[model samples]
Target: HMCDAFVGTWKLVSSENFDDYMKEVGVGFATRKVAGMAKPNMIISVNGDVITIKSESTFKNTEISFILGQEFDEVTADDRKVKSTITLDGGVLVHVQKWDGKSTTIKRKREDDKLVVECVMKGVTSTRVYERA
Candidate 1:
């Protein structure tokens, strides 16, 4: 899976332009406000052939598990039903999701002792940085 670097719990330490990025993602104002104000932790783990990405936050919690490089149904933090695929390229774990003809990509990579997540939808991009927890 080339995901050994990602297989750990990461605690959010910094964020950039998340509200604007979520706005571009079409998240409702109420949820966006809540999501924007809250910091989330991500837990990445592997079992058998499946990899799990679990996000926990004050606004809400969502967990998704899928096999790497394979498409699967996903219910996002905003509750969007999308077809999602997770693949590894270089040292980055690339996650792409499509729903209603629109798509978004989240690139996650390990940088030294931190985990960096770059969220992109259309032209807007958000970066959330995390430290090993």
Candidate 2:
């Protein structure tokens, strides 16, 4: 099972250019400040056709569960409600979210015992690396 590779708890190791990424996503400055104070982590679980991605930080906790290739409603950490879809392609779990006519893509892949998450929106990209915990 390809999804088996992602089923684990990952601790945030580093983040690059996430503030600008948040700005591009219309996150408020105050909220960004709060988010910046804590390291974000993820817990991923896969069972049958369902997968759950749970994000945690000092300020907030968000969880989303969906079947592969299924569309679902999601409320982001910054409180934006969007339509989201999860798809697996070439060993990467790609999550695409659309709201207010704007779209964002988050790609997750495991590489050398590390989980790499890339966020792209409006041509700006932010990369976050995580280690299994």
Candidate 3:
């Protein structure tokens, strides 16, 4: 059910200054430079309990794979290159990223035709709205 729930691809409609958001995670200048200069491409393919998400940009290429209802290390992505665990909290998928003894929580939900993601960290909250590709 969950696999079919996220079978299609989606493009970013708008990002909530996620670059500056990364800087809050203490990303170095060089990495932030590339990250800010590029657009991230994300693709998800799921089969039963296995999920593979491919996140790509001009500067970074990453693939995150895991199963549902389980806690696993999330690749810190392009900026910090840190590791954190991910778990589904109720209907929201939560990722605790950043390795500097800090936590980032991302809550995702769908409204109308848009996918809404709210990321909260370090007393700052940002929301990114996306649409299906």
Candidate 4:
């Protein structure tokens, strides 16, 4: 996970292009509403062949994991589990998760003072950038 820059704690501050990202991934409107309201705490833990991320908030807590370049089952934002693969693209870790006939690719990165996460599926792409707070 040397190329993975997403490991750490993050606080969701603001987002853009997320509505379409959620819609494309089939996340429910209710879940999106709740997700849009509160700040999410994200922690990424890496151990050799294993990588896990804990995304939590007052409304819900979601833990996701996968081996680098390996396909496995992954839960969606709406709690749907499907086949997924996560890997590194240059310095960014990108995930293409599929569930319930839907799939989305999430690209994640860490900048100077923030962690940036972007989702893209088919044609729609959305970005959710967070700062350390």
| CA lDDT scores, all candidates in order | 0.90, 0.92, 0.67, 0.79
Of 2 and 3, the candidate ahead on TM-score is 2
Cα error, candidate 4, residue 70 (Å):
1.3
- Extract clashing residue pairs from model 1: none
Clashes of each: 0, 0, 0, 0
- How large is the C-alpha RMSD of every model relative to the true structure? 1.1, 0.8, 2.4, 1.9
Cα deviation at 78, candidate 4, in Å, is 0.3
Q: What would the TM-score be for candidate 3 when compared with the true structure?
A: 0.79
Clashing pairs in 2: none
Predicted structure 3: lDDT: 0.67
Please give, for residues 50-132, the per-residue lDDT of candidate 1 as tens digits: 88999998878999999879999988888899999998888788999999999999999888899999999988999999998
What lDDT score goes with residue 105 in model 2?
Answer: 99
lDDT of 3 by residue, 40-99 (tens): 666778776787777677887888887754556655655454565556665565666656
Best by TM-score: 2
Residue runs of model 1 more than 4 Å from their true location after superposition: none
Q: Sort the candidates on lDDT, descending order.
A: 2, 1, 4, 3
lDDT of 2 by residue, 19-73 (tens): 9999999999999889867687799998788898999989899999999899999
